[PDB]
Amino acid sequence: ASPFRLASAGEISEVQGILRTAGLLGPEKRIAYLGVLDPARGAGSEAEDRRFRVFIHDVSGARPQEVTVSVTNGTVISAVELDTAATGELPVLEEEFEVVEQLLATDERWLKALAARNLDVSKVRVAPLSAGVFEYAEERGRRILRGLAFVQDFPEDSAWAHPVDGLVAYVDVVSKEVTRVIDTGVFPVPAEHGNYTDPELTGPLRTTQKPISITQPEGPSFTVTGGNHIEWEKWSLDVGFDVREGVVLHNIAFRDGDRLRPIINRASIAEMVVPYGDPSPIRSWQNYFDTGEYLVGQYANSLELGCDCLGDITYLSPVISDAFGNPREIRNGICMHEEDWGILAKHSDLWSGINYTRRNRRMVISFFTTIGNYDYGFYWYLYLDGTIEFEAKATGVVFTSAFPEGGSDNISQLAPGLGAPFHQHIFSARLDMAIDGFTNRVEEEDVVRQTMGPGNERGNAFSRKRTVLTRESEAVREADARTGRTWIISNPESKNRLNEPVGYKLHAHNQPTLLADPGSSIARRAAFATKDLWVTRYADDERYPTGDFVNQHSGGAGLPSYIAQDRDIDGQDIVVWHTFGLTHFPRVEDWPIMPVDTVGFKLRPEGFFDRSPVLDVPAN
């Protein structure tokens, strides 16, 4: 009954039939993206219309199309042909990944490069990577992937240990042509293996770890209704899943007495970029937009009980479309559980004689994705005290290169002859705010130091200042950890019992933002990543910080274009976009498989409640 329910297999099958009958899904067509559209603002008329947005690619070279379909009515709402040299190419298809290695295997230039290195072409894996936009005029309007080669010594070998440096190829995956093969010189292929399940590398496995058993003898404290509606410890929300963004949280609200109070209308990771900092021409083009170019949701893992998710786990199994419009279930793709989280509040009072301890817990919603060598976990946490937190977990195998004789300023050495280029992993969280409703505003809060003098004779005072962001042109903000900078999202029309506007404070980790030169291609295509915080006025079509069509888009799309409208954001329907990321200088300990590292952000209540919201937690 809920408009925010997950897409069903039946809905996707109906979309396929509607597209086929309309003549839009012939044998040459591929679905590059399919997802449900959110209800438009003002759905308080019960007139639900389940609409789907579809990107249709054509493998014969005809123009792709963007199509909107109503499964409720069984109709095509609109269908637009796309000029991809103007607005960008469609996301990469899973089936194009295979084309790259097969095409290169028959190319004379590729074979002569492998022959010079005495490599058997049957053992050479090619990583198919997105192209970006650089100096190659012949690439405008064509679908290009670039390939980097790795040697697999046997079928279960980790090819990442054996990069073939000095060699790169570019491939037109529609015309099936190899456009360029660049060979800058022979580097030795690193010889040590990286097989982290091989007993001679691991040694004998430890026998010292005793089991930890986490159970819930009465079941979990949360309920799931309507497939994806969660109620847990006064929280209420809907768990969505989109093939591009992955897990999306809708309608995050908190039950305060008999009032259901909204906090966040929609929360998602709306882009993530992985730029490489190696100036070698073999890799200086390398930038992954995992969300916008590859679609992180379609590579979500099936999560295993006891290994990936431990405890009393409730699973969701979202359904997505394959490239032909058939529904595909991602079995056990989302884990949901609660976790003990230590002490919530504690005080032993000498005067009253009362000793008081309460324990905290959090609700966890998570999925894991694998894009080539990298694996990312996305974790959303809700806490008893009203805190909302996101955490990204990065693991997998680092991308490798040769390590040059005589060292490098831009590459770490991991093993003899084996290097790992410097890079970043940068995320954009899109937070469509609804603090007690939709009239919100953002204030920037800095600590204020005071000078010793009149009215501060002992030089101990310090204060804070808040600056309201009133227009989009002034709402592009930088972190300042030294001044304790945070941002408060408040509702100026909703007051707590002290007559102060209710609010939530965003605490950033204050990690470095995009390091590339501001004149670079990546700085233009990932402009969101150059600043810590952006605030826009909500609009239906402003969904991604990088635009709708990220693949091979020349630049400037998304946030820099949106904020040029300079709209009023002072007590309006607003969206916060927070950039955060990891700067990765690989260490020896990251090899041959990397222990998890993390980054994230959190939001804490700031006068949202009239007192602590966890006074009614029992003693346990």
Residue among 3, 434, 1, 5 at smallest CA distance from 229? 5
From 64-72, 175-183, 350-358, 535-543, give the range in contact with a copy of itself by CB under 8 A: 350-358
Count other Cβ atoms within 10 Å, centred on residue 32.
23
Query: What is the smallest separation between the CB atom of 96 and Na ion, expressed in angstroms?
Result: 21
From 118-126, 152-160, 418-426, 428-436, give the range in contact with Na ion by CB under 5 A: 428-436
Specify the residue, 15 or 272, whose C-beta has the smaller distance to Cu ion: 272
Catalytic residue among 374, 381, 538, 544, which? Answer: 374
For Na ion, which residue of 554, 556, 570, 583 counts as binding (CB under 5 A)?
554
Residue among 481, 504, 476 at smallest CA distance from 569? 476
Catalytic residue among 290, 432, 532, 548, which? Answer: 290
Query: What is the smallest separation between the CB atom of 308 and a copy of itself, expressed in angstroms?
Result: 6
Query: What is the smallest separation between the CB atom of 46 and a copy of itself, expressed in angstroms?
Result: 30
Query: What is the smallest separation between the CB atom of 169 and Na ion, expressed in angstroms?
Result: 24
Query: What is the smallest separation between the CB atom of 298 and Na ion, expressed in angstroms?
Result: 26
Contact call for residue 433 and Na ion (CB under 5 A): yes
Contact call for residue 481 and a copy of itself (CB under 8 A): yes
Judged by DSSP in three states, 178 sits in strand
Specify the residue, 108 or 405, whose C-beta has the smaller distance to a copy of itself: 405
Specify the residue, 457 or 540, whose C-beta has the smaller distance to a copy of itself: 457
Query: What is the smallest separation between the CB atom of 45 and a copy of itself, expressed in angstroms?
Result: 33
From 159-167, 245-253, 511-519, 582-590, give the range in contact with Cu ion by CB under 5 A: 582-590
For a copy of itself, which residue of 69, 516, 526, 603 counts as binding (CB under 8 A)?
516
CA distance 604 to 100: 47
Considering only residues 231-250, where is the footprint of a copy of itself by CB under 8 A? Answer: 233
Contact call for residue 432 and Na ion (CB under 5 A): yes
Considering only residues 363-382, where is the footprint of a copy of itself by CB under 8 A? Answer: 368, 370, 372-373, 375, 377
From a copy of itself, Na ion, Cu ion, none, interface partner of 432 (C-beta below 5 to 8 A by class) = Na ion
Amino acid at 252: I
Contact call for residue 584 and Cu ion (CB under 5 A): yes
CA distance 262 to 436: 5
Specify the residue, 214 or 588, whose C-beta has the smaller distance to Cu ion: 588
CA distance 607 to 256: 13
Q: Going residue by residue from 510 to 549, which x/- string records binding to Na ion, judged by CB under 5 A?
A: ----------------------------x-----------
Give residue number: closest CB to Cu ion: 584
| Residue 297 assigned to a binding site | yes
Residue among 160, 156, 97, 144 at smallest CA distance from 298? 97
Count other Cβ atoms within 10 Å, centred on residue 149.
26
Contact call for residue 444 and Na ion (CB under 5 A): no
Query: What is the smallest separation between the CB atom of 542 and a copy of itself, expressed in angstroms?
Result: 28
Contact call for residue 467 and a copy of itself (CB under 8 A): no
Contact call for residue 214 and a copy of itself (CB under 8 A): yes
Query: What is the smallest separation between the CB atom of 480 and a copy of itself, expressed in angstroms?
Result: 8
* Residue 256 annotated in active site: no
CA distance 268 to 263: 14
Cα radius of gyration (the chain): 26
The arrangement of strands across the sheet holding 65-70 comes to 29-36, 51-58, 65-70, 75-81
For a copy of itself, which residue of 152, 236, 314, 494 counts as binding (CB under 8 A)?
152
Residue-wise DSSP of 28-56: TEEEEEEEEPPPPS--TT-----EEEEEE
Contact yes or no for 83/90 (Cβ under 8 A): no
* Residue 290 annotated in active site: yes
Measured CA to CA in angstroms, residue 171 lies from 99, 400, 522, 574 at distances of: 9, 21, 21, 42
Does the bond joining 592 to the residue before it have cis omega, within 30 degrees of 0?
Answer: yes
From Cu ion, Na ion, a copy of itself, none, interface partner of 573 (C-beta below 5 to 8 A by class) = Na ion
3-state secondary structure 72-111: CCCEEEEEEECCHHHHCCCCCCHHHHHHHHHHHCCCHHHH
Count other Cβ atoms within 10 Å, centred on residue 465.
11
From 192-200, 209-217, 434-442, 581-589, give the range in contact with Cu ion by CB under 5 A: 581-589
Contact call for residue 494 and Na ion (CB under 5 A): no
Bridge pairing between strands 533-537 and 476-477:
antiparallel
Contact call for residue 10 and a copy of itself (CB under 8 A): no
CA distance 598 to 618: 32
Contact call for residue 283 and Cu ion (CB under 5 A): no
Contact call for residue 488 and a copy of itself (CB under 8 A): no
Q: What pairs with residue 282 in β-bridges?
A: none
Query: What is the smallest separation between the CB atom of 584 and Cu ion, expressed in angstroms?
Result: 3
Judged by DSSP in three states, 166 sits in coil
| Residue 383 assigned to a binding site | no
Specify the residue, 44 or 453, whose C-beta has the smaller distance to a copy of itself: 453
Measured CA to CA in angstroms, residue 95 lies from 121, 294, 371, 548 at distances of: 21, 12, 14, 21
Task: Work out the end-to-end distance of the chain between its first and last CA atoms, rounded to an integer number of angstroms.
Answer: 37
CA distance 246 to 366: 10
CA distance 237 to 444: 28
Contact call for residue 249 and Na ion (CB under 5 A): no
CA distance 377 to 374: 10
| Residue 296 assigned to a binding site | yes
Query: What is the smallest separation between the CB atom of 59 and a copy of itself, expressed in angstroms?
Result: 22
Residue among 601, 266, 191 at smallest CA distance from 431? 266
Sequence length of the chain is 620
From Na ion, Cu ion, a copy of itself, none, interface partner of 396 (C-beta below 5 to 8 A by class) = a copy of itself
CA distance 422 to 587: 10
Specify the residue, 212 or 343, whose C-beta has the smaller distance to Cu ion: 343
From 3-11, 26-34, 280-288, 566-574, give the range in contact with a copy of itself by CB under 8 A: 280-288
Specify the residue, 415 or 433, whose C-beta has the smaller distance to Na ion: 433
Q: Which residues are annotated as a binding site for Cu cation?
A: 423, 425, 584
* Residues within the interface to Na ion (CB under 5 A): 432-433, 538, 554, 573
Q: Which residues are annotated as a binding site for substrate?
A: 288-299, 371-376
* Residues within the interface to Cu ion (CB under 5 A): 584
Q: Which residues are annotated as a binding site?
A: 288-299, 371-376, 423, 425, 584
Which residues have a catalytic role annotated? Answer: 290, 374
